[PDB]
Design a protein around this ligand. Structure first.
Ligand SMILES: NS(=O)(=O)c1cc2c(cc1Cl)N[C@H]([C@H]1C[C@H]3C=C[C@@H]1C3)NS2(=O)=O
Ligand SMILES: NS(=O)(=O)c1cc2c(cc1Cl)N[C@H]([C@H]1C[C@H]3C=C[C@@H]1C3)NS2(=O)=O
Ligand SMILES: NS(=O)(=O)c1cc2c(cc1Cl)N[C@H]([C@H]1C[C@H]3C=C[C@@H]1C3)NS2(=O)=O
Ligand SMILES: NS(=O)(=O)c1cc2c(cc1Cl)N[C@H]([C@H]1C[C@H]3C=C[C@@H]1C3)NS2(=O)=O
Ligand SMILES: N[C@@H](CCC(=O)O)C(=O)O
Ligand SMILES: N[C@@H](CCC(=O)O)C(=O)O
Ligand SMILES: N[C@@H](CCC(=O)O)C(=O)O
Ligand SMILES: N[C@@H](CCC(=O)O)C(=O)O
Lengths: 270, 260, 260, 270
């Protein structure tokens, strides 16, 4: 019985190949998550069919309804058997699905439009108007937002830290809304809002966007917290321990480091 | 029912108190792992007693009679209920004991005494002028043993067939050997321990190059035990509340007996 | 019996004379390969007539009907007795035709128009800003096709699936394309040809980085022919007498229409 | 029928292992030629046992008796089946044995004791008393020699170039003799003659010795000529074509340059 491997469409994890209109099957995609799924199949022998969720969401729980959506939602209710995607290991998610050991480390970062060079011996320096989340929350001219139905949104929603509490209170009562429906939408908003918008996304995607043309964006400060990407699996499934052992084996063998290096730094420019 | 907690005497994870001869019970111990155990017990609601593994070894197999020794062998043979300590999550251990989600990231680093002709691990392996060894009966020696990369294979082949014994018993012995070898010996050890050592008196060592790989410390328990899910949930909740970062800052940088 | 010698029109190996219309026979050709053929004929004692291969290709297989084309195809199908030309010694060719000892060393190089953001081949492969291609129906495209290294596999995958046609018919076309693309196209070709081109007017190109590999030019003959041992001995004697170096200096650096 | 793979004892081609006393067989040696023989065995399946020639010579033909000696000699008279070693492809050698395609390029170079650094703002410069072979032949204070019963000695013996002819004329009538019996002997004489001796040897050995401690020797000028190392084989044997094909396959596969890099520059002690 072939199981379906759900995934999100987020660079560089899963892409669309240049010659993909004529291609079909698991050969339409490329990136980090496709290599991860290939190595998982190599470790434990099974047939897998790549899939993209209908709503293109990572997964959240709607209030007053308690119906999960996105990748997590479609994995819980049984239309998929695994989720090999950049899914963040979360406490609320852990109670509904099974997460393997993290295969990549990450953190919440801040992305802003890259400031221009300062002429005033004839040396150049970078002057960023934001250097940390605290001063980001202190000011009120730069608007900041996150990805809707994501993990950062829930992290800010259920946070007791003072700075994150102020950031969440500002976010939930902003007109117009500061939340974006896609990472690409947030990056485009950052690039196009004349340096007046800051996007809070994961550090891996932040670095990937920073290393690609036209590279007019940069990351300020450090990670707000530390998390990891895990391979999700429905509760009480036969695939949990095998994929966990496969992740550990790939980490020991250096496959994960090689894939990260070849998908993040080898193909960069500028 | 009192839960027996096994752990190793490692700084700043578990250390003896200044006047520990007077206190008794769990009040004679201090450190990052003690606070982590206290938070876990608060989350779960059990009475725990701290114990130190009889042999100062984390975990290894005899390789001839398939006998585990150390904290892992303490857990496998029913002598302990949980191992809250800097126990690295590895493929060999995961098959015998149950691990939780990582509570701290780490890696293999290089520590030398205070022009840096070594940079990364490649130059250290290529240059035979300076000696290098790891801790025995640990996750570093077992990592270099099974490594299939040319640089780490060369390093392991040198280390195993090296005279005299390039391995040390405890990481304190490795630190003392590095401080005493006068730039001739390099120590390979966990990154977090390297930072803690380099940020302490008399600040005669530094961490050179980058991390060789990325691993984590997991809170271990016997396979199939009823505590694994509660401790995993406790670790996740502690990570999300930001108290793990608070504990790391408290035990790593809040003291900081160095100028950096 | 007159020996038919096949060769390609390549500078400075075989070139048409300035007033070749007036002369006839072998007197209308000049170059390194012409002098090499003259020396070989002197050593062996045979009357030879120079011919140019009908199709301006060195040697390749159709890959679908197993048909050889070029100088190798000329030798295989009995149309020629010897191939004194810059024919690279390769595994595929050696199985079908007989080669002699190399008479000149070479390698795969990179040629760009006159800060060098490319250096070696690794940065050329990683950086997709600048395009790069080789000569079709030659030993360079066949080298990149069969290469099992990651960098060369990536380069080949880019080159084959490249729009428009990144391959050129003759190396003169590739040189003109490099001079015309204005720093956007890089050419991969033999090292000796690269030096000869870069040491010629108007000196608008240079050879960047090191050689990708090391190969040689061999004097080819049909498999089992009676000429293989005498031509191999002639090549060895010419190498030991130092006249091959003399010919290379005469046709490469003696003229030297550049300031270096 | 197991064939014998004869080899000379030279570095970094074939070197005795540090713990070579208790070991026996083909495990007593390490270096470049052992890896080359292993790859040759892998390409074409056959069993081989490494051996060292009795006289420790590369091979030359004498007068009167006209009896070949060394590796070439003991390969011609049938007590060896193949010579995987740094054997130079020579015209006189080719008429008695079969030579494969060269697996490594080389040339005759000059090795001298490294001069002391010059005091003269406070920059250091290296000055050498010899910069070419012509300048080496012009002077008389610095003696120079080669290896007895080698390819370089025969190259100088039959040379017709004026500089090489005069160098040979000086060599044949020098008291005491300037020739050495081993490459290590020549290097020791260079290091002990306090700058009054120059050794002419192959470029590969010259670079290898230059890259090893105490690194008090240097190479001056450039290669006098161009030659190559080939795998020898008795005339008319059934092994010439397979070893030639193996050499070509190894060269195209990138094994040869990988071995050269790992045995020449991977252990630079200076
Ligand atoms: N350098 S990285 O982000 O690509 C990366 C990150 C990680 C890797 C491996 C790599 Cl290559 N493995 C670890 C795993 C190994 C064992 C210890 C923690 C988990 C189980 N998780 S991780 O710390 O999230
Ligand atoms: N900053 S740190 O090294 O003290 C650190 C490191 C880590 C933390 C939390 C902290 Cl504070 N949590 C993560 C865990 C949280 C969830 C996602 C990955 C594991 C499960 N592991 S981690 O990436 O190893
Ligand atoms: N200096 S050069 O490129 O013109 C050059 C290059 C070479 C020459 C001779 C010259 Cl002059 N001879 C050798 C040959 C001689 C004997 C040893 C190797 C082959 C057989 N091949 S080579 O190493 O390819
Ligand atoms: N760079 S090197 O000296 O180790 C080296 C030198 C040579 C190599 C391969 C290497 Cl790696 N192969 C060539 C061979 C390939 C084909 C062309 C000439 C012979 C047959 N001989 S070579 O030009 O003598
Ligand atoms: N990776 C996150 C979504 C991205 C974000 O929230 O920034 C998740 O799995 O929920
Ligand atoms: N802390 C490691 C051992 C330390 C080391 O090997 O450097 C473990 O749990 O095995
Ligand atoms: N001279 C080469 C072709 C030139 C090239 O491919 O660069 C040959 O004999 O095939
Ligand atoms: N390699 C040479 C000997 C070394 C030398 O003459 O320098 C040979 O095979 O004859």
């Amino acid at each position: 019985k072939t199981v379906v491997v759900t995934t999100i469409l987020e660079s560089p994890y899963v892409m669309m190949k240049k010659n993909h209109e004529m291609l079909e099957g698991n050969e339409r995609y490329e990136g980090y998550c496709v290599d991860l799924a290939a190595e998982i199949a190599k470790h434990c022998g099974f047939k897998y069919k790549l899939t993209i969720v209908g709503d293109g969401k990572y997964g959240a729980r709607d209030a007053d309804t308690k119906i999960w959506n996105g990748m997590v939602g479609e994995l819980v209710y049984g239309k998929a058997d695994i989720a090999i995607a950049p899914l963040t290991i979360t406490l609320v998610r852990e109670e509904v699905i099974d997460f393997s050991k993290p295969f990549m480390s990450l953190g919440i970062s801040i992305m802003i439009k890259k400031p221009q060079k300062s002429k005033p011996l004839t040396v150049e320096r970078m002057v960023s108007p934001i250097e940390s989340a605290e001063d980001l929350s202190k000011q009120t001219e730069i608007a900041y937002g996150t990805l809707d139905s994501g993990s950062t949104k829930e992290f800010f929603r259920r946070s007791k830290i003072a700075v994150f509490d102020k950031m969440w209170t500002y976010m939930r009562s902003a007109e117009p809304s500061v939340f974006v429906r896609t990472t690409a939408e947030g990056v485009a908003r950052v690039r196009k809002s004349k340096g007046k918008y800051a996007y809070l996304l994961e550090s891996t995607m932040n670095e990937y966007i920073e290393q690609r043309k036209p590279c007019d964006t940069m990351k300020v400060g450090g990670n707000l917290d530390s998390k990891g990407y895990g391979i999700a699996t429905p509760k009480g499934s036969s695939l949990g321990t095998p994929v966990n052992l496969a992740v550990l084996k790939l980490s020991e063998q250096g496959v994960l480091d090689k894939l990260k290096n070849k998908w993040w730094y080898d193909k960069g420019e500028c």
